[PDB]
């Protein structure tokens, strides 16, 4: 779902 | 870590 996409993007940003 | 970030970015692209 879109929300699973946003959650993954959030994790990526958290890992920068 | 890095590898998780790479997989998450890949998953997002794949899912868009």
Author numbering:
A (entry chain B), B (entry chain A): 1 to 16
Describing publication, verbatim:
Citropin 1.3 is an antimicrobial peptide secreted by the amphibian Litoria citropa (Southern bell frog). In this study, the structural and functional properties of its non‐amidated form, which self‐assembles into distinct fibrillar architectures, are investigated. Using cryogenic electron microscopy, X‐ray crystallography, and fluorescence microscopy with model membranes and cells, diverse supramolecular structures, including canonical amyloid fibrils, multilayered nanotubes, and a novel mixed fibril type, are identified. Citropin 1.3 with free, charged termini, has a net positive charge of +1 at neutral pH, primarily consists of hydrophobic residues (9 out of 16 residues) and adopts an amphipathic α‐helical structure in its monomeric form.
Citropin 1.3 was found to form cubic microcrystals, which diffracted to a resolution of 1.6 Å. The crystal structure revealed two chains of the 16‐residue peptide within the asymmetric unit. These peptide chains adopt α‐helical conformations, tightly packed through hydrophobic interactions involving residues such as Ile5, Val9, Val12, and Leu16. Additionally, a hydrogen bond is formed between Lys8 on chain B and Ser11 on chain A. Each chain also exhibits an internal electrostatic interaction between Lys8 and Asp4. The α‐helical dimers further assemble into a spiraling supramolecular structure. Inter‐dimer interactions include tight packing between Phe3 and Lys7 of neighboring chain Bs, alongside interactions with Leu16 from chain A. Furthermore, Ala10 and Ile13 from chains A and B of adjacent dimers engage in hydrophobic packing, as do Leu2 and Ile5 from neighboring A chains. These tightly packed helices collectively form a supramolecular assembly resembling a nanotube. The fibril's surface features alternating hydrophobic and positively charged zigzagged belts. Nonetheless, the structure confirms that citropin 1.3 can adopt α‐helical conformations in addition to the β‐strand‐rich structures observed in cryo‐EM studies.
